[PDB]
Scaffold this active site. Sequence first.
Site, PDB file in Angstrom:
ATOM      1  N   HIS A 134       0.806  -1.223   0.000  1.00  0.00           N
ATOM      2  CA  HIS A 134       0.000   0.000   0.000  1.00  0.00           C
ATOM      3  C   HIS A 134       0.836   1.268   0.000  1.00  0.00           C
ATOM      4  O   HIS A 134       0.297   2.345  -0.270  1.00  0.00           O
ATOM      5  CB  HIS A 134      -0.939   0.044   1.214  1.00  0.00           C
ATOM      6  CG  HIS A 134      -1.811  -1.162   1.335  1.00  0.00           C
ATOM      7  ND1 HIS A 134      -2.703  -1.522   0.350  1.00  0.00           N
ATOM      8  CD2 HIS A 134      -1.911  -2.106   2.300  1.00  0.00           C
ATOM      9  CE1 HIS A 134      -3.327  -2.628   0.709  1.00  0.00           C
ATOM     10  NE2 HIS A 134      -2.863  -3.005   1.887  1.00  0.00           N
ATOM     11  N   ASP A 171      -2.582 -11.144  -1.813  1.00  0.00           N
ATOM     12  CA  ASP A 171      -3.204 -10.591  -0.621  1.00  0.00           C
ATOM     13  C   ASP A 171      -4.657 -10.225  -0.929  1.00  0.00           C
ATOM     14  O   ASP A 171      -5.005  -9.857  -2.053  1.00  0.00           O
ATOM     15  CB  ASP A 171      -2.395  -9.350  -0.237  1.00  0.00           C
ATOM     16  CG  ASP A 171      -2.759  -8.806   1.119  1.00  0.00           C
ATOM     17  OD1 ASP A 171      -3.813  -8.148   1.253  1.00  0.00           O
ATOM     18  OD2 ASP A 171      -1.978  -8.998   2.075  1.00  0.00           O
ATOM     19  N   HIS A 173      -6.314  -7.738  -0.134  1.00  0.00           N
ATOM     20  CA  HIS A 173      -6.467  -6.320  -0.419  1.00  0.00           C
ATOM     21  C   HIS A 173      -5.715  -5.917  -1.682  1.00  0.00           C
ATOM     22  O   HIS A 173      -4.658  -6.466  -2.009  1.00  0.00           O
ATOM     23  CB  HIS A 173      -5.935  -5.479   0.733  1.00  0.00           C
ATOM     24  CG  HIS A 173      -6.586  -5.782   2.044  1.00  0.00           C
ATOM     25  ND1 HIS A 173      -6.006  -6.591   2.997  1.00  0.00           N
ATOM     26  CD2 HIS A 173      -7.788  -5.405   2.542  1.00  0.00           C
ATOM     27  CE1 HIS A 173      -6.816  -6.675   4.040  1.00  0.00           C
ATOM     28  NE2 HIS A 173      -7.907  -5.976   3.782  1.00  0.00           N
ATOM     29  N   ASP A 264      -4.389 -13.115   3.958  1.00  0.00           N
ATOM     30  CA  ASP A 264      -5.686 -12.736   4.497  1.00  0.00           C
ATOM     31  C   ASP A 264      -6.858 -13.252   3.669  1.00  0.00           C
ATOM     32  O   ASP A 264      -8.008 -13.036   4.057  1.00  0.00           O
ATOM     33  CB  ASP A 264      -5.782 -11.226   4.770  1.00  0.00           C
ATOM     34  CG  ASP A 264      -5.004 -10.373   3.781  1.00  0.00           C
ATOM     35  OD1 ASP A 264      -4.644 -10.875   2.689  1.00  0.00           O
ATOM     36  OD2 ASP A 264      -4.760  -9.187   4.115  1.00  0.00           O
TER      37      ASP A 264
HETATM   38  C1  LIG Z   1      -5.336  -1.679   6.308  1.00  0.00           C
HETATM   39  C2  LIG Z   1      -5.874  -3.004   6.771  1.00  0.00           C
HETATM   40  C3  LIG Z   1      -5.310  -4.214   6.174  1.00  0.00           C
HETATM   41  C4  LIG Z   1      -4.240  -4.192   5.370  1.00  0.00           C
HETATM   42  C5  LIG Z   1      -3.752  -5.438   4.755  1.00  0.00           C
HETATM   43  O1  LIG Z   1      -3.966  -6.575   5.141  1.00  0.00           O
HETATM   44  N1  LIG Z   1      -3.044  -5.193   3.600  1.00  0.00           N
HETATM   45  O2  LIG Z   1      -2.589  -6.263   2.945  1.00  0.00           O
HETATM   46  C6  LIG Z   1      -6.866  -3.120   7.660  1.00  0.00           C
HETATM   47  C7  LIG Z   1      -7.521  -1.940   8.311  1.00  0.00           C
HETATM   48  C8  LIG Z   1      -8.733  -1.513   7.494  1.00  0.00           C
HETATM   49  C9  LIG Z   1      -7.927  -2.330   9.713  1.00  0.00           C
HETATM   50  O3  LIG Z   1      -8.499  -3.387   9.913  1.00  0.00           O
HETATM   51  C10 LIG Z   1      -7.634  -1.425  10.819  1.00  0.00           C
HETATM   52  C11 LIG Z   1      -7.638  -1.978  12.103  1.00  0.00           C
HETATM   53  C12 LIG Z   1      -7.386  -1.206  13.209  1.00  0.00           C
HETATM   54  C13 LIG Z   1      -7.124   0.164  13.058  1.00  0.00           C
HETATM   55  N2  LIG Z   1      -6.896   0.951  14.180  1.00  0.00           N
HETATM   56  C14 LIG Z   1      -6.474   0.340  15.440  1.00  0.00           C
HETATM   57  C15 LIG Z   1      -7.133   2.390  14.184  1.00  0.00           C
HETATM   58  C16 LIG Z   1      -7.132   0.730  11.760  1.00  0.00           C
HETATM   59  C17 LIG Z   1      -7.386  -0.061  10.661  1.00  0.00           C
HETATM   60  K   LIG Z   2      -4.178  -8.344  -3.932  1.00  0.00           K
HETATM   61 ZN   LIG Z   3      -4.180  -7.594   3.076  1.00  0.00          ZN
END
Ligand SMILES: CC(/C=C/C(=O)NO)=C\[C@@H](C)C(=O)c1ccc(N(C)C)cc1
Ligand SMILES: [K+]
Ligand SMILES: [Zn+2]
Length: 357
Positions: A134, A171, A173, A264
């Site tokens: 990302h 992945d 995402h 994931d």
């Molecule tokens: C970015 C992501 C996965 C990325 C991935 O797997 N990329 O490959 C998940 C985010 C949406 C998420 O779940 C999250 C959880 C807690 C949080 N705070 C504790 C504030 C902020 C965001």
């Molecule tokens: K992907």
């Molecule tokens: Zn992911």
Amino acid sequence: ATGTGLVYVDAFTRFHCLWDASHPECPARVSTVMEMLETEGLLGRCVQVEARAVTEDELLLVHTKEYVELMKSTQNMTEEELKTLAEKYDSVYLHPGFFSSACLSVGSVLQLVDKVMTSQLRNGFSINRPPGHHAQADKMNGFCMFNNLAIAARYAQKRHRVQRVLIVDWDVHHGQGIQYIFEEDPSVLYFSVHRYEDGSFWPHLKESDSSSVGSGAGQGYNINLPWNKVGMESGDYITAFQQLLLPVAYEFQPQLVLVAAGFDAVIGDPKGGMQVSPECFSILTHMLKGVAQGRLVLALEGGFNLQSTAEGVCASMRSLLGDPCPHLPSSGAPCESALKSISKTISDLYPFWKSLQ
Ligand SMILES: CC(/C=C/C(=O)NO)=C\[C@@H](C)C(=O)c1ccc(N(C)C)cc1
Ligand SMILES: [K+]
Ligand SMILES: [Zn+2]
Ligand SMILES: [K+]
């Protein structure tokens, strides 16, 4: 060209969320992977490869000078300053040791690229955090500071004279950072299969749809396969690889394959919503070994179920090591929704790839 490399350093466990001892992107992600590789006897069969810190010049293959300087400055920021900065990004935390670990995380991939391109190893896997897919030229995102695989791709081209790099992102995402970095670049083909749900799944970008095929001379070299229903299984991923990714890969003729290896999508992940058996990743890894003379480097991205991520890494590692492919516990047929997504992506990419016609 013999041996499977593995990079792991203790520094990968030495940054974490300072205000949430329960944060899902955590040191235990990599230590649990290493623990399972050891108990399965896989760790001892790999060639241990040292990490190194990425250099400024290497970072600047992808990232702006201003962003590199700002990230470098985070090693001395107060916790309040780190909180303020992290709020300027989407789904990011910061830590005083984030920059240093991020530099080793990039460098771990570069080390494996060196070993693979010089034929000292057949392939390799970095068990690295922070993740990378990302991260963008000038911003953190999604728990990523630097785009590990994007840097590695341009590094392989510059240092090892590679012409064409394929990046496969399995992945759950979308690796929008990789897409943005290479959007206008036909020398790096980015393929991402990801949960999308018409944009209602993170990172919530219209650019994650299959209509985003690249821009300018990069048209045709960005391939998004969005899933619009949860519960996809091994047969859906196998079909995506057979009808879409591998035909394009063989036409593209990459000299190096880099995998954004997140787990994931595996059954058991807390948020991915998919039902892919860990064994499927043995098969997907096997398929990619038929490209680029098997010059294949996997780098850990996401996957938040500690055990499921470890199982997915182990399944991929068995294939890197050349072990027989496993028995697949699920059906080999895709579902209708997967076929719909695959057909749409093929329709969007048809003008650019003779193998899709
Ligand atoms: C970015 C992501 C996965 C990325 C991935 O797997 N990329 O490959 C998940 C985010 C949406 C998420 O779940 C999250 C959880 C807690 C949080 N705070 C504790 C504030 C902020 C965001
Ligand atoms: K992907
Ligand atoms: Zn992911
Ligand atoms: K591209």
